[PDB]
Amino acid sequence: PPKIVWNEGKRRFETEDHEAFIEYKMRNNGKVMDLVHTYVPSFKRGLGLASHLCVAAFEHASSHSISIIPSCSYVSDTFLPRNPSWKPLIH
């Protein structure tokens, strides 16, 4: 499919194996989620895993009324230009 989980205390959604993850920094007293860096290791690259990590932070922020700061350059450069319908999520 696959599967991504929320590791809240590390502040990221990540692959269950902990190796792929998108990290954020919350701001504005819980109202904003700043997506600061995303990480997929090599061998796992080019298979959409990065859109999947972004797809995990966006479905989540979206279900809680939290807007996104797209700091990570993967977010406002590849992921968002390919997923415009996520753009109204932007703070």
Ligand SMILES: CC(C)(COP(=O)(O)OP(=O)(O)OC[C@H]1O[C@@H](n2cnc3c(N)ncnc32)[C@H](O)[C@@H]1OP(=O)(O)O)[C@@H](O)C(=O)NCCC(=O)NCCS
């Ligand atoms: C990029 C990251 C989100 C992992 O992504 P991923 O699962 O490989 O993303 P995918 O490979 O499926 O994405 C492919 C797309 O991401 C984009 N991308 C790659 N690096 C990027 C960057 N630094 N910033 C923005 N977008 C980028 C490419 O434009 C590519 O589109 P193209 O080949 O398809 O037409 C991120 O979590 C990471 O840490 N990457 C490290 C990547 C790296 O070190 N590459 C070294 C290449 S020498």
